[PDB]
Amino acid sequence: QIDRLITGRLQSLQTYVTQQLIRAAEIRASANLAATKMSECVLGQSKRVD
Amino acid sequence: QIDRLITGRLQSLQTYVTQQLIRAAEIRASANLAATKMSECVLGQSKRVD
Amino acid sequence: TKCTLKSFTVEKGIYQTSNFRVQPTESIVRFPNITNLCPFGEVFNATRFASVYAWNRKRISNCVADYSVLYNSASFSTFKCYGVSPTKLNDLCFTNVYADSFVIRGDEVRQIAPGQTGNIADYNYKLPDDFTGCVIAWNSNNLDSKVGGNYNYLYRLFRKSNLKPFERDISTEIYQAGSTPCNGVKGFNCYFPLQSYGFQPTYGVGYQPYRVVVLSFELLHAPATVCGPKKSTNLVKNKCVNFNFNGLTGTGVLTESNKKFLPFQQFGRDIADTTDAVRDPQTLEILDITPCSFGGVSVITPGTNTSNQVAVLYQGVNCTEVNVFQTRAGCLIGAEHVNNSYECDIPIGAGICASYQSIIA
Amino acid sequence: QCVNLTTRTQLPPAYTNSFTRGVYYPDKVFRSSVLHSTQDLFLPFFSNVTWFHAIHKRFDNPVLPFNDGVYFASTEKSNIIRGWIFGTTLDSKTQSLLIVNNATNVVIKVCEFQFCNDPFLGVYYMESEFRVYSSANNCTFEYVSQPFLNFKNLREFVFKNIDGYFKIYSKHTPINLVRDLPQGFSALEPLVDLPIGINITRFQTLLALHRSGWTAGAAAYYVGYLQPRTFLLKYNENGTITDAVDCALDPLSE
Amino acid sequence: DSTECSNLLLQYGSFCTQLNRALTGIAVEQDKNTQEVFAQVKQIYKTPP
Amino acid sequence: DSTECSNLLLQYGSFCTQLNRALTGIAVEQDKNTQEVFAQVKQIYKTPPIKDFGGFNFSQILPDPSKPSKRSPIEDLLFNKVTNGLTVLPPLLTDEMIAQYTSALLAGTITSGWTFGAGP
Ligand SMILES: *[C@@H]1O[C@H](CO)[C@@H](O[C@@H]2O[C@H](CO)[C@@H](O)[C@H](O)[C@H]2NC(C)=O)[C@H](O)[C@H]1NC(C)=O
Ligand SMILES: *[C@@H]1O[C@H](CO)[C@@H](O[C@@H]2O[C@H](CO)[C@@H](O)[C@H](O)[C@H]2NC(C)=O)[C@H](O)[C@H]1NC(C)=O
Ligand SMILES: *[C@@H]1O[C@H](CO)[C@@H](O)[C@H](O)[C@H]1NC(C)=O
Ligand SMILES: *[C@@H]1O[C@H](CO)[C@@H](O)[C@H](O)[C@H]1NC(C)=O
Ligand SMILES: *[C@@H]1O[C@H](CO)[C@@H](O)[C@H](O)[C@H]1NC(C)=O
Ligand SMILES: *[C@@H]1O[C@H](CO)[C@@H](O)[C@H](O)[C@H]1NC(C)=O
Numbered sequence: 048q049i050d051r052l053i054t055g056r057l058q059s060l061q062t063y064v065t066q067q068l069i070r071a072a073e074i075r076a077s078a079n080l081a082a083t084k085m086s087e088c089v090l091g092q093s094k095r096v097d
Numbered sequence: 098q099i100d101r102l103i104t105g106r107l108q109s110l111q112t113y114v115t116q117q118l119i120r121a122a123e124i125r126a127s128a129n130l131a132a133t134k135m136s137e138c139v140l141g142q143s144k145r146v147d
Numbered sequence: 148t149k150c151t152l153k154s155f156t157v158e159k160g161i162y163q164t165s166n167f168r169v170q171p172t173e174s175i176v177r178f179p180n181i182t183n184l185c186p187f188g189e190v191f192n193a194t195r196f197a198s199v200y201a202w203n204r205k206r207i208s209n210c211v212a213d214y215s216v217l218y219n220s221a222s223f224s225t226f227k228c229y230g231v232s233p234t235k236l237n238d239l240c241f242t243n244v245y246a247d248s249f250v251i252r253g254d255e256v257r258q259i260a261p262g263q264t265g266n267i268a269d270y271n272y273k274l275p276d277d278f279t280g281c282v283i284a285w286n287s288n289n290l291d292s293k294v295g296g297n298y299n300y301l302y303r304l305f306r307k308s309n310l311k312p313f314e315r316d317i318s319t320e321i322y323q324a325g326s327t328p329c330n331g332v333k334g335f336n337c338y339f340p341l342q343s344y345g346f347q348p349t350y351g352v353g354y355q356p357y358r359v360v361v362l363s364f365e366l367l368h369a370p371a372t373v374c375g376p377k378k379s380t381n382l383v384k385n386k387c388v389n390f391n392f393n394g395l396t397g398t399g400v401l402t403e404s405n406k407k408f409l410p411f412q413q414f415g416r417d418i419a420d421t422t423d424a425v426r427d428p429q430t431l432e433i434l435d436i437t438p439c440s441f442g443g444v445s446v447i448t449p450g451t452n453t454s455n456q457v458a459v460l461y462q463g464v465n466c467t468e469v470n471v472f473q474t475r476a477g478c479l480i481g482a483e484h485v486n487n488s489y490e491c492d493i494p495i496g497a498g499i500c501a502s503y504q505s506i507i508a
Numbered sequence: 509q510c511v512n513l514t515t516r517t518q519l520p521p522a523y524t525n526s527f528t529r530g531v532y533y534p535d536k537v538f539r540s541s542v543l544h545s546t547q548d549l550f551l552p553f554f555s556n557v558t559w560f561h562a563i564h565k566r567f568d569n570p571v572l573p574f575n576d577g578v579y580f581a582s583t584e585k586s587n588i589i590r591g592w593i594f595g596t597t598l599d600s601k602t603q604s605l606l607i608v609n610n611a612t613n614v615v616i617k618v619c620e621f622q623f624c625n626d627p628f629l630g631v632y633y634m635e636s637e638f639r640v641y642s643s644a645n646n647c648t649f650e651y652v653s654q655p656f657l658n659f660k661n662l663r664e665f666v667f668k669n670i671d672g673y674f675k676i677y678s679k680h681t682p683i684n685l686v687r688d689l690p691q692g693f694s695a696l697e698p699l700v701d702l703p704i705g706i707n708i709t710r711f712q713t714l715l716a717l718h719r720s721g722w723t724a725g726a727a728a729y730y731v732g733y734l735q736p737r738t739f740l741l742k743y744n745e746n747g748t749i750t751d752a753v754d755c756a757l758d759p760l761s762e
Numbered sequence: 763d764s765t766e767c768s769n770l771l772l773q774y775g776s777f778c779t780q781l782n783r784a785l786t787g788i789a790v791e792q793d794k795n796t797q798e799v800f801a802q803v804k805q806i807y808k809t810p811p
Numbered sequence: 812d813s814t815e816c817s818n819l820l821l822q823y824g825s826f827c828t829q830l831n832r833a834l835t836g837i838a839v840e841q842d843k844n845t846q847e848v849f850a851q852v853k854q855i856y857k858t859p860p861i862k863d864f865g866g867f868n869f870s871q872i873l874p875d876p877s878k879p880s881k882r883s884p885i886e887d888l889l890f891n892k893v894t895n896g897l898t899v900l901p902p903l904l905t906d907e908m909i910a911q912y913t914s915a916l917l918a919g920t921i922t923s924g925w926t927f928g929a930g931p
């Protein structure tokens with residue numbers, strides 16, 4: 048019975064950690080973009096359109 | 098017993114391949130950044146701040 | 148490649164199709180020296196055997212037992228097992244062995260059996276209904292019998308109640324055949340329970356004295372000290388063989404090792420907990436276990452619209468272990484190595500590329 | 509034959525520090541230039557080990573609970589400690605294990621012994637006094653082997669009862685310290701595994717008297733207890749354990 | 763807090779250590795992201811009164 | 812090498828094929844990454860033998876002829892400061908060819924400005 052509960056909860060936790068890793072990669076990409084905007088729009092004047 | 102070992106080792110291998118794919122995405126993003134820096138800082142003079 | 152890609156046309160490129168394996172050639176089983184043998188010579192071939200009411204019990208333990216010599220002996224007239232198999236005695240392991248030795252008549256040899264009812268079974272030697280082990284009996288007319296009659300072998304004839312299994316009774320209490328009071332004084336209906344046998348050389352088969360040794364096995368929670376013999380084979384080195392060293396099995400190439408073990412250590416492990424070093428139990432030498440040369444089989448081809456010529460890359464495989472060229476990526480068979488440098492058409496790896504112009508590398 | 513020893517001086521037992529002693533090899537596996545974390549019955553670092561004396565008038569032979577294992581440390585000169593007494597009730601009702609080292613060899617017996625209340629040996633200044641048992645009725649296992657043996661010698665022992673196997677680990681160390689346990693590192697090699705298969709809950713050291721009443725030769729020994737914990741063991745290039753980390757001692761080693 | 767559950771969970775190996783390591787990496791990555799975005803100056807400038 | 816294990820593993824289908832294909836995609840993606848980063852020029856430029864650049868010194872970044880690896884002293888220091896079915900595929904570009912690509916980029920940006928990145 049604990050073997051069934053352990054494999055179910057371990058599969059749930061692995062799914063959660065995988066989704067968190069993908070979302071952390073997306074947020075890291077957004078934060079790299081935000082740091083680029085902080086460097087190029089605030090600390091200088093940008094010729095890049097839009 | 099072999100089926101238990103098979104599903105455990107298959108879960109381990111799927112976990113390894115998933116985290117390798119996530120790290121491959123991160124390394125691909127870093128390499129795209131490095132190619133951008135190669136094009137814009139080495140092959141030319143960049144007006145982009147920092 | 149067409150089988151792997153599930154298509155009848157193959158585009159130009161390199162395709163990993165299969166997995167080269169160095170197949171194991173031999174089986175090497177090395178097991179340590181068969182010493183400290185069990186003393187079966189002082190039980191089966193002792194000087195004087197015991198009587199059946201006082202059967203001698205020898206405890207066989209903390210030794211390795213060779214039952215094949217006992218089983219292949221043709222002197223034994225009866226070799227009957229009731230809980231095990233005779234051909235699996237050299238394979239099974241037991242905690243200890245009880246050897247019960249006595250002498251009986253030739254017609255009473257069948258009475259040492261589970262479920263058998265007789266005078267020897269009820270009053271002299273009783274076996275349980277779930278008995279495990281083997282009963283061994285052989286004729287001893289040339290040794291035990293005397294021309295004046297061997298009266299030294301006694302047997303119990305009378306008792307009020309039947310025996311429990313593996314119970315001895317050396318008491319000499321006078322039996323009461325009737326209901327008259329006997330205070331140890333013999334009378335008309337009070338007889339001594341132990342009578343002597345009539346072993347003489349003129350009797351035929353059935354009245355001759357038979358020496359019986361009964362081996363009983365125990366399978367308690369004590370460790371199995373009594374095991375069968377181990378037949379170690381010769382050692383073969385520098386080949387991808389299946390090794391079996393003291394119960395540790397695997398597949399590998401066994402080469403000489405420069406690792407100096409401490410004398411208490413037997414196996415060797417790397418960082419990743421894989422057995423890469425081992426000690427042979429027969430001769431105390433250290434062997435490295437290199438894994439066999441597994442590799443990926445890749446097929447380098449142009450398009451099937453262009454040509455049907457292919458090249459085979461065995462990845463991470465030396466060319467002596469499989470137009471043959473050795474690369475750092477592996478062994479490339481079917482491509483002609485040239486000294487000219489071109490642009491990369493089909494990537495091999497480690498700076499090697501292949502192209503069609505025949506296939507050149 | 510049994511003799512009450514009635515010329516003892518009453519004194520409470522002592523305690524001292526284990527430092528980084530009591531480490532043994534957990535397995536028969538060679539390891540090269542690697543750090544191995546293992547979960548086994550280990551002696552805690554810097555622990556409270558029980559200290560017993562033999563000095564003149566001290567003669568410390570009590571019976572102690574075995575627990576899950578025994579670390580025996582011996583600061584020994586002139587070979588006073590000769591063996592140990594192993595069992596549960598230490599009488600003829602149960603089955604007991606005997607380890608003795610007399611003047612010739614080591615004898616290991618598993619039988620039903622009747623132990624004396626005060627068992628000892630004796631040397632006349634020549635060993636001619638054996639009073640450790642009064643009877644031996646039902647033997648199941650006998651094993652004769654090669655002998656194991658200012659304080660000059662240091663003797664470490666680990667005794668374990670796991671799945672009917674009796675593991676004896678030992679190490680000989682040349683020391684020159686007078687009183688306490690020296691501070692250092694020495695991993696105990698496996699000596700002999702015994703197929704005993706018996707229950708053991710209590711133990712007792714066997715000493716030797718010196719006769720010239722009786723006189724106790726100068727000796728001191730230490731008893732430590734094995735607990736299930738984790739060590740991080742360091743294996744050098746030659747494959748000997750040179751250092752260890754107790755994972756439950758302090759947060760730094762954690 | 764079930765010790766039998768943890769004894770059975772130790773048979774599956776280092777899955778829990780892997781998940782804790784991944785979550786720790788995400789947790790330090792968030793602080794790295796905030797450090798990279800907002801701490802682009804080492805001087806705290808002040809406006810005139 | 813257990814055949815009963817592989818017979819039971821065939822019941823699960825093409826999981827192994829998916830894992831191998833994902834790892835193959837990662838392996839070719841690494842070579843594509845190195846190709847996109849370093850192979851940005853199709854002309855292998857060299858510096859002139861006389862290093863007269865108006866007082867500017869590039870000896871720490873130009874390749875050392877005395878070293879067999881043809882690396883710069885900085886690149887040599889960088890390479891010194893970095894220390895069961897499993898296989899490691901070698902990279903398509905060796906370290907010598909990556910050093911040759913960086914040497915060509917350095918020679919182009921020293922001798923020709925930014926003009927080599929936009930044309931001749
Ligand atoms: C040494 O002292 C012990 C402790 O008193 C003795 O053991 C007792 O002996 C008496 C003798 O009849 C028994 O009644 C007690 O039951 C024993 N005590 C225990 C705890 O068993 C021992 O006999 C003495 N030795 C000698 C040789 O007299
Ligand atoms: C450019 O820099 C290099 C090194 O930074 C100079 O080489 C040094 O020259 C002096 C004297 O000639 C030697 O003592 C040093 O040992 C040299 N250093 C090395 C690392 O070799 C070089 O002189 C500089 N100028 C030119 C024109 O090349
Ligand atoms: C007596 O029996 C033992 C059984 O172990 C056997 O080894 C031995 O060879 C026998 N003796 C003779 C003379 O055959
Ligand atoms: C074991 O048997 C081999 C057989 O040749 C022998 O060389 C060796 O000395 C024996 N003893 C040990 C301890 O290996
Ligand atoms: C060891 O235990 C004794 C009593 O059991 C105690 O008095 C002593 O302080 C302890 N030693 C240490 C170092 O704590
Ligand atoms: C071993 O002995 C102790 C006390 O002597 C007892 O509590 C325990 O139950 C015994 N173990 C077994 C397995 O009988």
Ligand SMILES: *[C@@H]1O[C@H](CO)[C@@H](O)[C@H](O)[C@H]1NC(C)=O
Nearest residue numbers: 608609610611612613615635
């Ligand atoms: C040591 O003990 C053994 C076994 O009890 C015995 O045979 C031997 O004689 C003893 N040694 C001496 C010197 O008494």
Ligand SMILES: *[C@@H]1O[C@H](CO)[C@@H](O)[C@H](O)[C@H]1NC(C)=O
Nearest residue numbers: 600620643644645646647648
């Ligand atoms: C143990 O010894 C006693 C007395 O010698 C004896 O009565 C008993 O039968 C023996 N038990 C075993 C199992 O040997």
Ligand SMILES: *[C@@H]1O[C@H](CO)[C@@H](O)[C@H](O)[C@H]1NC(C)=O
Nearest residue numbers: 407743744745746747748750
């Ligand atoms: C290992 O052994 C060699 C001798 O073979 C010795 O020179 C070296 O110092 C030893 N290393 C250690 C760490 O003890």
